[PDB]
Amino acid sequence: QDLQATEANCTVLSVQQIGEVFECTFTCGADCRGTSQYPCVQVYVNNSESNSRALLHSDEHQLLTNPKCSYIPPCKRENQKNLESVMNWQQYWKDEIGSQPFTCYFNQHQRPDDVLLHRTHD
């Protein structure tokens, strides 16, 4: 499944303080996979193309507001330090999606890459 094209989710986390829980995903050989559970985290995009999750800090003020959110061991491929660039990130999604996560699904089993692009609705 993961080895072949099939499921790939692309969602922009929503902006919330606390009261939300998220799960992380991992992929290994021998048909073995692992997941982790952690409270609410900053805002960015979840790359479930296989088992990756990217988190970005919208601002330090949010951390002071929800310091017990990402304090738990977060799973990120890279720190991705971003300063003024972070403001542009919100402007890019805020101007298009406004603030609604989305999921995707695609499979090469057919021949190329038929993909789906469902969006989150409030």
Side-chain angles (χ1 to χ4, degrees), residues 28-117:
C28 110
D31 296 345
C32 110
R33 294 101 82 68
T35 73
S36 295
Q37 287 275 254
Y38 47 108
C40 116
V41 275
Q42 307 302 311
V43 180
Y44 196 61
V45 67
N46 314 154
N47 295 342
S48 340
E49 305 184 351
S50 75
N51 74 345
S52 56
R53 189 88 94 159
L55 57 101
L56 187 70
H57 299 17
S58 305
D59 196 5
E60 186 184 1
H61 177 76
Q62 188 179 353
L63 185 73
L64 187 68
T65 299
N66 62 5
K68 297 185 185 76
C69 256
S70 295
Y71 87 108
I72 249 160
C75 14
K76 66 186 192 297
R77 294 186 302 187
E78 184 184 1
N79 308 269
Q80 298 178 344
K81 186 190 294 88
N82 294 344
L83 277 289
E84 186 184 1
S85 302
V86 173
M87 211 308 293
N88 193 17
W89 138 276
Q90 187 209 252
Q91 190 179 353
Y92 175 91
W93 290 118
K94 185 183 187 79
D95 293 349
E96 302 183 351
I97 68 176
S99 268
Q100 0 176 139
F102 56 115
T103 65
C104 23
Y105 297 96
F106 96 106
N107 63 60
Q108 182 174 352
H109 292 246
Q110 295 178 344
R111 241 169 111 160
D113 57 10
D114 185 84
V115 65
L116 251 295
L117 190 92

